[PDB]
């Protein structure tokens, strides 16, 4: 399981923060796909999120003007925390805490999202948002299909590569 990057240089965020948030996201999705994440239910077709520097730049605009991403019909998640130590270890922890927000995690785990980008600002407090290309609806079922072994197994979107039992596509629009 390795990060998949598209773009660019709206990627302003230091690699370790990016990879931390991406591994948190896709680590969870891959487990849910294999039906083996305590609390998330049966196996299903799951797309990996592509890390997208364009969506990271959108996340940047959403931090400095909330409401922006909704205008472009995007999913958004937010997480913050007061902290004192190393910035990076603060974030590792915040994500743990984040991962207990049933509401937030619906966007994080939505099987039909295919790309996202996050951004953060330090104020000690850190604030992050991630922007997602697809936003679920309230009550929308996430179950469906099977975890993929080969490309044929991916059905939600055209031209998907199955890897690490996650489906990837660069064209979901
Ligand atoms: Ca393969």
């Amino acid at each position: 399981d390795i990060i998949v990057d598209n773009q660019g240089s709206g990627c302003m965020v230091d690699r370790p923060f990016r990879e931390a948030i991406d591994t948190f996201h896709n680590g969870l999705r891959q487990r849910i796909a294999k039906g083996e994440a305590e609390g998330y239910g049966p196996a299903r077709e799951m797309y990996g999120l592509v890390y997208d520097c364009g969506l990271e730049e959108e996340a940047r605009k959403e931090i400095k003007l909330p409401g922006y991403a909704d205008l472009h019909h995007r999913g958004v998640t937010r997480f913050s925390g007061d902290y004192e130590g190393s910035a990076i270890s603060a974030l590792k922890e915040i994500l743990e805490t984040f991962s207990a927000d049933k509401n937030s995690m619906r966007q994080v785990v939505y099987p039909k999202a295919t790309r996202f980008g996050c951004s953060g600002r330090l104020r000690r407090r850190m604030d992050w948002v991630c922007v997602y290309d697809k936003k679920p609806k309230d009550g929308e079922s996430f179950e469906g299909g099977k975890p993929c072994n080969e490309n044929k197994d991916c059905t939600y979107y055209k031209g998907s590569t199955c890897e690490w039992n996650l489906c990837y596509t660069f064209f979901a629009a």
Side-chain angles (χ1 to χ4, degrees), residues 1-37 39-123 125-136 138-145 147-151 153-157 159-170 172-173:
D1 194 29
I2 284 298
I3 194 179
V4 182
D5 231 289
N6 206 203
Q7 321 319 319
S9 248
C11 279
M12 305 202 188
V13 161
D14 282 339
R15 175 193 190 100
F17 310 79
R18 182 179 78 234
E19 292 182 357
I21 302 175
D22 173 91
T23 299
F24 166 91
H25 273 81
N26 282 307
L28 218 201
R29 298 190 144 230
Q30 164 186 249
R31 279 157 48 205
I32 304 183
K34 284 140 79 177
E36 73 187 41
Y40 289 96
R44 71 261 265 164
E45 185 175 339
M46 180 78 64
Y47 276 76
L49 300 176
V50 173
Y51 196 93
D52 187 316
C53 305
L55 298 185
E56 159 161 357
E57 174 50 25
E58 296 196 5
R60 195 193 66 89
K61 301 227 219 307
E62 167 79 8
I63 293 178
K64 82 154 175 272
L65 183 69
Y68 170 93
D70 189 34
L71 282 186
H72 300 271
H73 302 119
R74 304 295 208 199
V76 171
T77 56
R78 286 174 201 80
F79 46 106
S80 343
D82 282 333
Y83 78 96
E84 277 180 354
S86 78
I88 172 61
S89 269
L91 175 266
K92 296 265 204 56
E93 268 174 326
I94 278 176
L95 288 177
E96 205 167 325
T97 291
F98 178 43
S99 79
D101 196 75
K102 270 175 292 125
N103 255 76
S104 292
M105 295 294 109
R106 291 198 77 238
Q107 175 66 73
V108 171
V109 157
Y110 185 29
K112 286 183 163 64
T114 68
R115 42 172 96 215
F116 82 132
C118 310
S119 193
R121 76 160 157 25
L122 302 309
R123 255 155 63 265
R125 183 169 175 87
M126 60 176 36
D127 302 280
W128 295 89
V129 350
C130 309
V131 162
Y132 309 70
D133 69 337
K134 273 89 177 63
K135 176 191 184 202
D138 319 79
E140 179 178 349
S141 174
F142 288 0
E143 284 156 42
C148 72
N149 297 276
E150 64 188 83
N151 305 359
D153 290 347
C154 302
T155 73
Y156 291 152
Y157 298 92
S160 310
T161 282
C162 172
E163 219 42 80
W164 317 295
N165 49 253
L166 280 172
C167 310
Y168 290 85
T169 189
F170 295 92

